[PDB]
Amino acid sequence: INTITFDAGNATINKYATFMESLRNEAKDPSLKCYGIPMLPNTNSTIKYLLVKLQGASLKTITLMLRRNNLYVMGYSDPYDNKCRYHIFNDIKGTEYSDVENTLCPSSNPRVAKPINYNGLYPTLEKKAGVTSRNEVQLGIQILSSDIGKISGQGSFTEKIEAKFLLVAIQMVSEAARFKYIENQVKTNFNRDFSPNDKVLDLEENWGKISTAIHNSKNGALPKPLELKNADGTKWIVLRVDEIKPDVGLLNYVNGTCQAT
Numbered sequence: 220i221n222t223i224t225f226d227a228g229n230a231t232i233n234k235y236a237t238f239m240e241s242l243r244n245e246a247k248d249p250s251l252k253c254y255g256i257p258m259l260p261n262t263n264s265t266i267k268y269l270l271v272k273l274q275g276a277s278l279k280t281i282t283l284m285l286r287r288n289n290l291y292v293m294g295y296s297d298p299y300d301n302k303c304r305y306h307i308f309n310d311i312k313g314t315e316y317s318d319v320e321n322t323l324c325p326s327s328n329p330r331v332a333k334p335i336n337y338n339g340l341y342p343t344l345e346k347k348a349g350v351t352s353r354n355e356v357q358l359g360i361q362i363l364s365s366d367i368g369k370i371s372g373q374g375s376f377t378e379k380i381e382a383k384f385l386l387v388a389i390q391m392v393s394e395a396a397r398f399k400y401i402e403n404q405v406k407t408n409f410n411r412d413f414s415p416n417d418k419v420l421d422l423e424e425n426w427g428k429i430s431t432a433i434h435n436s437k438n439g440a441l442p443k444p445l446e447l448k449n450a451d452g453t454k455w456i457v458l459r460v461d462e463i464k465p466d467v468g469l470l471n472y473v474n475g476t477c478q479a480t
């Protein structure tokens with residue numbers, strides 16, 4: 220399946236919303252769903268990866284490669300010096316490494332490695348970006364576009380701007396697909412830069428908890444109370460599926476049956 224493209228250089232709300240829909244429909248297991256929310260496949264599916272190509276206003280591109288099962292970025296490529304340059308995290312090794320290497324940059328064409336000399340966890344990226352928290356890194360359509368120009372085709376770029384590009388790209392592509400609330404935060408602030416509020420970071424950190432809770436809900440009631448945070452950082456207690464369902468776009472894979480609808 221198809222490489223999904225998003226042009227951040229000439230974007231509209233509607234084009235971003237189409238991109239989210241396309242990404243959610245390619246990523247979801249077509250059979251799996253709980254309370255009408257699509258679920259991601261587990262690790263042994265037919266197609267294990269997705270490629271997402273981003274284009275800046277400079278017309279330069281970066282392609283992200285995502286694990287389909289959890290939408291984590293494994294690496295990215297950019298056109299550099301008439302070669303496909305591939306950038307992979309330092310903890311991707313063996314069979315995954317070379318599925319990544321060869322899917323971003325086919326063997327039959329010139330290529331060159333430029334490693335990411337760290338892993339992709341949010342704590343790691345925040346330290347390389349020089350922040351205590353990622354709410355200090357602003358998000359936005361213009362920022363995503365400008366960050367692509369700073370890396371794509373450049374012989375040298377710092378680990379600080381690469382770790383900031385990956386904090387913006389992971390939240391605007393992967394977290395936005397997992398959560399309709401973070402997608403709606405990008406559309407609400409489409410014409411401006413903005414900081415992720417406390418509900419955006421809390422949902423990102425509790426995607427696995429939320430997915431297990433919904434899956435195990437009986438008749439729409441969560442197994443036990445789920446303590447999340449509101450946009451302003453105050454405590455939010457969730458007791459029923461329909462209370463959290465407007466903010467969720469995709470479920471992590473949870474084994475067993477659940478109420479489909």
Ligand SMILES: *[C@@H]1O[C@H](CO)[C@@H](O)[C@H](O)[C@H]1NC(C)=O
Binds near residue numbers: 474475476
């Ligand atoms: C996954 O769920 C199936 C169906 O209930 C069950 O048979 C199997 O034991 C489960 N696998 C794991 C690893 O728990």
